[PDB]
Amino acid sequence: MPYVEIIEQPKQRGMRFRYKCEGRSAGSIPGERSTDTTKTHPTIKINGYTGPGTVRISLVTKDPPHRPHPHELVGKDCRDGYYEADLCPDRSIHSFQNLGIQCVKKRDLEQAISQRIQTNNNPFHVPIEEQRGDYDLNAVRLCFQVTVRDPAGRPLLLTPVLSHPIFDNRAPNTAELKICRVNRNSGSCLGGDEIFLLCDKVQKEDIEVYFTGPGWEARGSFSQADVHRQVAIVFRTPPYADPSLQAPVRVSMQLRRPSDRELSEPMEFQYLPD
Template identity: 50%
Template structure:
């Protein structure tokens, strides 16, 4: 099979002695050209994984807005996609965003997307843009609305009627094994070429987004410790106030450098999911000469999520538990003071005698 160059691209042509209808040969050439020219869709900025609350429609409040992973206290960013690669023959790009399950194979999720680019009641978001003006598109005011359990089947049926099944899973598995507290954004991209033909790119999924109000996936946080210092021997009883935790899915870690130890507590020491009574572990060294600061943080067992740390100080061991040295020092200081007072009195007496006038006879 010979090949010839067309417009800077290599396209297949008929071999010698073989004839090919002009229309079929042109169609094969156009197909190969289009394959070579296909761009790819990428997630330019991931959504922020934690901190957003999924809201029910009946709450009557906005579902909030999914922020970008690079958002901070001083600046807010948004999830974004980008069309990468050649775009010279593309006229328009249409992207459909839906929610899928956390685990592969990614199935349609019954929860809904809501926002300015989401038609009422559809649960999906559809945007179109010209890549020649801007290859990148950011999603503003995109929120997650959760569906009540009795409405899960109806919501999935709506996805089927919309033909939303990006990974062709058939939705055959039961909804009972779906995690309702975690979703991913799925982006399906349709290209419209200059000649009017359309192509679909492979769907792309985002990092998972966790529901803030769910104790199994929410962000861990330590609010307060009632004691922040204790001996190196450990066993200091501390009361911790924290955001909601699961008593069978949490541990408290003490860490400094490569050293790491777990606090001691039982499930019965977790009170109403917001307080934990625990005992400190012994520090790795028992003969430190000065206070040592370590980090204390919560860790969830199911997903190894860590909270931001707070500090705790290990103090040197008390080498004089009965305060013998302190009492001896106090006694020595008192004795020295008494002697000083006596010496001072004798000196004043001697001075007064030396300054007195001689007696006349």
């Protein structure tokens, strides 16, 4: 097959989701390796054609089978909850740079679904029986629809492909994990130290404090009633896998999430005697 390939996947974290009341554009979407300096945008590649036709982008649930989604895509060449333009005959390398996510309100859900049905907005034209399930309105996936030409001048339509799942930063249970301030950055190795920490949004339930050394796992101890307003954690430092020590040695302290396992920035922590 002349086919469809995804190269710049999208930045799963680091983005928030905006409603009908928050500017009809919401900037654009970054690529997984975008970082302000070398700031890139999501792209695809086509192998076995370079010429005219059509490109479409729709929105599908994370977990399969992948239904259309009750959320909308807004900006350039965008309409009816997707993006439609005309493919560029120049190359077979493609970038989408004015791209938005609009989230729809949980009562407007059924309306949205109806609209999608009306459109035929469904890559994997699934039955309207299973299109009942339950919905994920944190997480969205990207699906690609393409029409080209055989060496006659018909239209020809290709295998539709999936992206890394894309997440909401205002959203609590899938927010990007950051550590903002701290109360110290070195106590004794013996463990007992109690530490005051200020962070981006975190939920008290699913959340630990995680330490890694040259092979070594420790967890530092606190109850869901030490978590003050979801942005503050108070804990006790687990002793070292070597109580005796003597020198100073330095490790890593992070925030994990037992369900998905996503890790914060790492901040440097040092261990002492007496």
